[PDB]
From a paper:
Our comparative bioinformatics studies suggest that among those reported as glycosyltransferases are also pseudo-glycosyltransferases (such as [name], EC 2.x.x.x), which do not recognize sugars as substrates but rather catalyze the formation of non-glycosidic C-N bonds in the biosynthesis of C7N-aminocyclitol-containing natural products such as acarbose and validamycin A. Validoxylamine A is generated through the dephosphorylation of validoxylamine A 7′-phosphate by VldH while validoxylamine A 7′-phosphate (VDO) results from a condensation of GDP-valienol and validamine 7-phosphate (both are pseudo-sugars) by the [name], [name]. Similar to OtsA, [name] is comprised of two Rossman β/α/β domains which are oriented in a GT-B configuration. As was described in a recent crystallographic study of ValL, a [name] homolog from [name] subsp. jinganggensis, [name] is a homodimer.
Within the [name]•GDP•TRE structure, six monomers were modeled within the asymmetric unit (ASU). Represented within the six monomers were three differing conformations of the N-terminal Rossman-like domain (two monomers per conformation). The monomers of the first conformation contained both GDP and trehalose, and this first conformer was found to also have an “open” catalytic site with similar global conformation to the [name]•GDP•VDO complex (RMSD Cα = 0.705 Å). The sugar moiety of trehalose within donor cyclitol binding site makes interactions with the backbone amides of residues Gly384, Gln385, Asn386, and Leu387 as well with the side-chains of Asp383 and His182. However, the sugar moiety of trehalose occupying the acceptor cyclitol binding site makes only a single hydrogen bond with Arg290 in our study. A superimposition of trehalose and VDO within the [name] catalytic site shows that trehalose does not assume a binding pose comparable to VDO. Indicatively, Arg326 and Asn325 swing out of the catalytic site within our trehalose bound structure. The second and third conformers have only GDP within the catalytic site and both of these conformers share a dramatic shift in residues 11–50 which result in the “closing” of the catalytic site. Resultantly, Gly33, Gly34, and Thr35 move 10.9 Å towards the catalytic center, and within 4 Å of the ligand atoms. Therefore, the closing of the [name] catalytic site is more likely to work at least partially through a more dynamic, equilibrium based mechanism.
Author numbering:
A (entry chain B): 5 to 20, 26 to 76, 78 to 264, 270 to 478
B (entry chain A): 4 to 264, 269 to 477
Write the structure that this text describes.
């Protein structure tokens, strides 16, 4: 019997009664997993509509994915507990701590808010734990799949009630270096770990994340013993195993925005694509393109920055959008009017179409847990587009050889790579794109779900 | 042993001498070089460093191949000042500031918005190379007539020097000492490809690489392993095997120089009269964190019992204008004003001159000492202050200071980013009775006292030897 819980569900209630999940983001991923495994899933009720929906149906709400039909069991939290955790989680706290948003010299500075969110997080965690254990209460052997960085607190709680059941905690974001983790206040930095370690298996998308996690546990829990070879953690009589389970794309979930086809006609098209989130790094990308375009030969080339609006209420995300806009404008002032454009909407089909039309794809994240875009876009591109991929994406551990692996902070290197990519002829690119697509293709959602099960199974058996 | 010490500068002084109208050049004591002269196994010592005044430049021109300084104990040292191309020197200085290098090793970048490397990094890198060579050339050239020369290389700016020595002295013992932190592997990677590997290339050829703290060595090992797929690291032995050369990393903590150990700045005595004094002292550099300290102070005083309590921010100024420094000062002064405007007038004060006496007077007067650096290679103030404090002052110490690995058990140990913890620490420290404080201050001094400058020098000599022996 398999029980899967995910923090986040972006459902929309329109009329064809009609409830559906938004594509992209982790939510769709975990929902797809429920479809593969044929289960219910557990997630939180965000909006009032979600709260209303769960009240009417306690047994489960039914929604259609971007593909399939899944059955969610939403949780109604406290509307002040939950609203506050959805600040803690955000870059203000949790997001900034795992995706490297702090400079230390001037940010962060923790106060009373941190103790309060940390408490609310405890309530939010129990909310989830109680709800897993309940809907799994009539199960002789249950198997727990806990998905993500919000549900970090969860395994410790489950292990109390089900101390012999297999638990996988899977984190979809990076884990930072020990030194950076310590920035977090003491109760949080150890408390988070106290809740993760009781899991049978902790998984990430990349080795670097697993290594950083171990170094953290060794830096903060003295009565702990780690094995960098075995990727293991023994602590208070828990044996925890760390695993890399890379993920690429969903085969199933696979035309152009207004005026784009026209603007790009007879032009080489550079495409940056990513969420309105500072880590996607489109400011630096636009900057690096200007750098390439003074270095000439880039004529007849145009850049398109695809953004997907997301959490624009967090100052950072909206500042990122502003930084990017300013750069685009400055680029157009220097290189000539309409050289670069932004397209900032939420249509996932518009994005895939841009993946298709691209001559050069840039995925230069400052950091990224994986980046599924960098798998999808080659697998759909019809132009044999080159791919500039940052060394700091989890994906680079799988496709870095097959791509122009760049340092996301170096503009000169990013520009030179853009120049190189665009100077390559059709036959050179066709060749490269061919291999890229071969390196990408086998990393399917189905195959990742399998990797979770096979991993958990073997690790549970090695107790 | 024949010893060749290299560092950024050599502490020298000059007068006009009476009865000849002739310049006189001394060599103010307590220099790292003077201490090495005084050791056991060494026959003679030659010091190489950058010229940096019309005195330095003119002396170098007078004796281009070095001159022998006269020490106490009848010892002499050879001091060779390098006259670099000024433009090279200027750009290398800038390259070492928070504009680029300082932020790489002292954790100043948020990744999301800074940094963004341009052509400047490449220009700077090249000057760093030209400067590195200038040094390497000078070292070798004055160790030309030496059979088994021992090379001591100090300071971050001389990092590239070991590779350039081995090239010509493949069997010589070479110690490189780094006085600043070594950042995490993921953070080191932020640097542009040429620089991040470049630096490591120039370092590893040393026999021993030393830092002030374990965390630094570990972070360096993790960098190496992440960046040189050829290299091979051993955490247990703290040794690196790369291209047939085996490097050993040694943690050699330094606390203070006894030779360096006044009177309070104008108006400080009277302003602080019959008041408990909180002291924060550090250079005007972002990492010293003064302002998180002022904010933690407010947080503590708000909860009361900070009655009759006051706070002085000691700051040492910087000769150049570096933006990150200027912004830190703004941030501080804003925090100081918001504190005074809440706790009443003249509750907190900044004092901002360059005078090592005034600093010590402040150390002597302190009722509570704060050293909450965001990061710090060691922080030598946290040893000096307890050893000169006349009032059994407690110490709040960042867990991110190198010094914490030696003094953290003898101080109140803080996460320098957590304001609440810092405030609670301040409150506790100030609630203690004088006897409690006396005891904890005896222990604190007794743990600081051994870590002398001489003990540190010996640790290098001894460790380089042991490591050159395998
Ligand atoms: N709803 C929506 N989804 C998108 C859009 N563009 C891309 N996506 C999807 O969102 C995913 C992006 O994930 P990734 O690039 O790994 O970074 P993430 O944002 O952290 O998931 C991709 O798999 C796309 O299929 C868009 O404009 N709207
Ligand atoms: N030149 C100078 N030295 C100072 C001043 N204030 C303190 N110091 C000394 O500088 C040392 C502090 O160094 P530390 O905080 O470890 O970092 P550093 O600033 O890089 O040396 C202490 O031992 C003080 O004796 C000042 O205003 N000017
Ligand atoms: O601006 C550079 C600074 O370098 C030194 O500071 C380092 O060296 C100290 C000991 O020599 C350490 O205690 C300290 O942790 C390091 O930051 C120098 O002492 C400073 O004065 C310079 O400003």
């Amino acid at each position: 019997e398999i029980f899967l819980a995910s923090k986040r569900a972006a459902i929309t209630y329109d009329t064809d009664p009609r409830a559906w999940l938004a594509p992209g983001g982790t939510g769709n991923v975990v929902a797809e997993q429920a479809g593969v495994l044929n289960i219910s899933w557990i997630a939180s009720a965000d909006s009032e509509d979600d709260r209303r929906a769960s009240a009417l149906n306690p047994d489960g709400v039914t929604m259609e994915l971007h593909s399939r039909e899944i059955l969610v069991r939403l949780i109604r939290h406290d509307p002040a507990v939950f609203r506050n955790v959805q600040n803690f989680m955000t870059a203000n706290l949790m997001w900034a701590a795992n995706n490297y948003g702090w400079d230390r010299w001037t940010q962060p500075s923790f106060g009373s808010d941190a103790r309060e969110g940390w408490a609310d997080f405890g309530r939010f965690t129990r909310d989830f734990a109680d709800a897993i254990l309940k809907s799994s209460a009539q199960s002789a052997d249950p198997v727990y799949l806990v998905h993500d960085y919000q549900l970090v607190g969860v395994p410790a709680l489950l292990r109390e009630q089900r101390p012999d059941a297999p638990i996988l905690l899977f984190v979809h974001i990076p884990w930072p270096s020990a030194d950076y983790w310590r920035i977090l206040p003491k109760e949080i930095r150890t408390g988070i770990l106290h809740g993760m370690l009781p899991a049978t298996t902790i998984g990430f998308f990349a080795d670097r994340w697993c290594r950083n996690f171990l170094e953290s546990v060794a830096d903060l829990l003295p009565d702990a013993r780690i094995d960098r070879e075995a990727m293991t953690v023994e602590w208070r009589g828990h044996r925890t195993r760390l695993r890399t389970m890379p993920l690429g794309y969903s085969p199933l979930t696979l035309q152009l925005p207004e005026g784009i086809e026209e603007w790009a006609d007879g032009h080489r098209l550079v495409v940056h694509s990513g969420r309105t989130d500072p880590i996607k790094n489109a400011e630096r990308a636009v900057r690096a393109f200007v750098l390439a375009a003074r270095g000439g030969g880039l004529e007849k080339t145009r850049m398109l920055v695809r953004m997907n609006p997301n959490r624009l209420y967090v100052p950072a995300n909206a500042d990122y959008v502003h930084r990017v806009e300013t750069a685009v404008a400055e680029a157009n002032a220097e290189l000539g009017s309409d050289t670069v454009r932004i397209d900032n909407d939420n249509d996932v089909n518009h994005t895939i179409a841009c993946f298709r039309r691209a001559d050069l794809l840039i995925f230069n994240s400052t950091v990224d847990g994986q980046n599924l875009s960098t798998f999808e876009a080659p697998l759909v591109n019809e132009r044999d587009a080159d791919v500039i991929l940052s060394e700091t994406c989890g994906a680079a551990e799988v496709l870095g050889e097959y791509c122009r692996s760049v340092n996301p902070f170096d503009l000169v290197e990013q520009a030179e790579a853009i120049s190189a990519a665009l100077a390559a002829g059709p036959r050179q690119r066709a060749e490269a794109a061919a291999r890229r697509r071969d390196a990408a293709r086998p990393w399917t959602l189905e195959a990742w779900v399998q990797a979770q099960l096979d991993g958990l199974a073997a690790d549970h058996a090695a107790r």
